[PDB]
Design a binder for this molecule. Structure first.
Ligand SMILES: *C(=O)[C@@H](NC(=O)/C(=N\OC(C)(C)C(=O)O)c1csc(N)n1)[C@@H](CNC(=O)NCc1cc(=O)c(O)cn1O)NS(=O)(=O)O
Length: 501
């Protein structure tokens, strides 16, 4: 047939420090000219066996393509297997040097790095998103004979194969290993269906770690479980629930109508809105200050603040921080989710927006929103590649409001009745837990550290824990603690729980 393509060397993927994540490995593809193969039928059984193929089934294949001038025998053999076939010296058997990807960290960064197809083209994750950058251009050599199939001359070798370009990801493999191990262990300890964990640099917008459970070995090109290949952190949507309350609180503080010391009466732990009932879990409260509403995670408390300030102000904070918004990461199949909106907000939708019931967001959007809040209200564009020059970013929340909300979230973790399991020994950590009824539950924790100068934002999402305790503060908060403690030390972040220096 017409023309053969010389596969280009696909670009190397590394983590932010140059540790290899996806490496192009030489493989040998064997093809044949059936016309010449017919001249050596006594060689076919040995050839069939060297290719693993059945003697009769292989002979059937060749005879069927007797007219064809080219056919593929086998693709992607190791250079050792490919040479064994060439050692047989079978007339009409030819070889082409192809490429296949090897993933040294395997299952650890599978979803982030991605996977390639049979033609070495990106199929998932980064491999897919930066395919054009990584692929380069195939080789151009005119296969010329006369009228047979025996390449008489290697004539015009013009614009030949151009190698693909190297790509350094934002991922730090050291933090990725830790995040992977801890999420894997929590899934097992909780008998959970799935999970996601995202670590972000609040200053640069870099994704330092992104792990999901279940995971798969991208080096094992058979079995391929589609559910295990899902990059849940970027493709699965969920109700963020109580994890959005810091954004409702940001709108309250920016309104001019609320201060942290203000009190909201949440008695009797229920609130009547038309034919709908807002309900708190622990209904043992009356007066709660704004920090108290977050510690007790009062849906009633947050809904009352929402009615006073208006849903517009809340929606705008949530929209500006990127919840239910396009991340601009350009990963095909990435889910945008939904942030409900109205011209005229009824009372029930105002409340559910405020406590995160009406919405669908991804783990990446949630971590990005928490990064804006942690970075004194400045949102920095999300990046899956190493950021050397930080873009300007947008001041979505005023520095004063974001700083107040950070202090309240520090109290959520440290105060009496708080999320003590999120505490990071040696540092001041801040965050908010979430528990969403899908009885099936989703356990959440979103936070950042150190509170003195936030460096890392983290989201821990545990899908369907199956033990007695399913609450976010019980299931996800310790994962945050464990991952945070290690990540801050791996990044040499100085401990900040110090004696008033
Ligand atoms: C925020 O996420 C809140 N969750 C909810 O209100 C939602 N469901 O709540 C549960 C799981 C209890 C339910 O309805 O069965 C929800 C929001 S969006 C969606 N789809 N579902 C708070 C609610 N507070 C809470 O869970 N309290 C924890 C708790 C339980 C307890 O028994 C004691 O003694 C003390 N505490 O604190 N969830 S939270 O995890 O953010 O707090």
């Amino acid at each position: 047939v017409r023309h053969i393509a010389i596969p280009a060397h696909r670009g190397l993927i590394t983590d932010r420090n140059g540790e290899p994540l996806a490496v192009s490995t030489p493989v040998t593809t064997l093809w044949a000219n059936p016309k010449e193969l017919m001249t050596a039928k006594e060689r076919w059984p040995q050839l069939a066996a060297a290719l693993g193929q059945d003697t009769k089934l292989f002979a059937d294949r060749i005879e069927q393509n007797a007219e064809r001038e080219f056919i593929y025998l086998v693709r992607g053999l190791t250079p050792e297997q490919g040479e064994g076939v060439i050692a047989l010296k079978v007339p009409g058997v030819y070889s082409i040097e192809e490429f296949r990807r090897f993933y040294p960290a395997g299952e650890v960064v599978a979803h982030a790095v991605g996977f390639t197809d049979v033609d070495d083209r990106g199929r998932e994750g980064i491999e897919l998103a930066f395919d054009e950058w990584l692929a380069g251009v195939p080789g151009k050599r005119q296969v010329l004979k006369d009228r047979r199939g025996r390449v008489i001359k290697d004539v015009q070798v013009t614009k030949n194969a151009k190698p693909g370009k190297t790509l350094a990801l934002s991922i730090d493999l050291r933090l990725q290993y830790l995040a992977h191990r801890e999420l894997r262990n929590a899934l097992l300890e909780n008998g959970a269906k799935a999970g996601s964990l995202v670590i972000m640099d609040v200053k640069t917008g870099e994704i330092l770690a992104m792990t999901n459970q279940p995971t798969y070995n991208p080096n094992n090109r058979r079995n391929l479980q589609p559910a295990a290949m899902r990059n849940r952190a970027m493709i699965d949507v969920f109700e963020p629930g109580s994890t959005v309350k810091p954004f409702s609180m940001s709108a309250a503080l920016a309104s001019g109508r609320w201060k942290p010391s203000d009190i909201v009466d949440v008695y009797p732990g229920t609130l009547q809105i038309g034919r709908y009932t807002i309900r708190d879990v622990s209904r043992n409260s009356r007066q709660l200050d704004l920090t108290g509403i977050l510690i007790k995670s009062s849906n009633v408390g947050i809904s009352k603040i929402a009615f006073d300030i208006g849903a517009e102000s809340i929606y705008s904070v949530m929209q500006q921080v990127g919840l239910g918004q396009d991340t601009g990461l350009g990963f095909p199949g990435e889910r945008v989710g939904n942030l409900p909106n109205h011209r005229k907000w009824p009372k029930a939708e105002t409340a559910t927006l405020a406590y995160g019931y009406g919405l669908s967001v991804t783990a990446i959007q949630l971590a990005h929103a928490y990064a804006a809040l942690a970075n004194d209200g400045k949102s920095v564009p999300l990046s899956m590649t190493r950021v050397d020059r930080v873009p300007d970013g947008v001041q979505v929340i005023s520095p004063e409001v974001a700083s107040t909300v950070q202090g309240m979230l520090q109290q959520v973790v440290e105060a009496q009745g708080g999320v003590f399991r999120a505490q990071v020994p040696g540092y001041h950590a801040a965050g908010k837990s979430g528990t969403a009824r899908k009885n099936a539950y989703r356990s959440l924790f979103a936070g950042f550290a150190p509170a003195t100068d936030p460096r890392i934002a983290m989201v821990v999402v545990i899908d369907e824990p199956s033990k007695a305790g399913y609450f976010g503060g019980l299931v996800s908060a310790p994962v945050f603690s464990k991952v945070m403690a290690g990540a801050l030390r791996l990044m040499n972040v100085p401990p900040d729980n110090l004696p008033t220096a």
